[PDB]
Amino acid sequence: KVFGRCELAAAMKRHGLDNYRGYSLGNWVCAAKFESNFNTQATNRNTDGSTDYGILQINSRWWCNDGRTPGSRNLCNIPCSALLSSDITASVNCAKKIVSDGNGMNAWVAWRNRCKGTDVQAWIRGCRL
Ligand SMILES: O=C/C=C/c1ccccc1
Ligand SMILES: O=C/C=C\c1ccccc1
Ligand SMILES: [Cl-]
Ligand SMILES: [Cl-]
Ligand SMILES: [Cl-]
Ligand code: NA
Hints:
Elements: H1 5-14, H2 25-36, E1 43-45, E2 51-53, E3 58-59, H3 89-99, H4 109-114
Helix pairs in contact: 1-2
The structure holds (2E)-3-phenylprop-2-enal (9Y6), (2Z)-3-phenylprop-2-enal, chloride ion (3 copies) and sodium ion (NA).
(2Z)-3-phenylprop-2-enal is lined by residues 122-123, 125.
Organism: Gallus gallus (Chicken)
Pfam families: Lys
Protein name: Lysozyme C
């Protein structure tokens, strides 16, 4: 599913991300924009052989099982395919664990590089939510 901007914002808020661990909704929308262009089906292979899945490009190195990342962990206790669903629940719940693990949203390098420090409220401006 490719979400619209405001549509994703709404969904994220319904699933409990608005201000989760102190990160406003525009932070989460901005991260999703640059990780996946709001596409739940996004995947990208990392040169080491792990893969990133879904709207928030969650990495099989640590967070999900895809059967093809030697030595990895599955801390969210889910198949990586769950992160590709049109329903964002699995991605949101796993993101809550990631953002809680000590480094906040810096876990998403693209958030650090393209969202952190910017006017992230622009991502939710005007939305009905
Ligand atoms: O963009 C880099 C890699 C993309 C990709 C996506 C799914 C599996 C393998 C590779
Ligand atoms: O507030 C702006 C609406 C959409 C959009 C465009 C670019 C950046 C943020 C959001
Ligand atoms: Cl915001
Ligand atoms: Cl594996
Ligand atoms: Cl933090
Ligand atoms: Na894994």
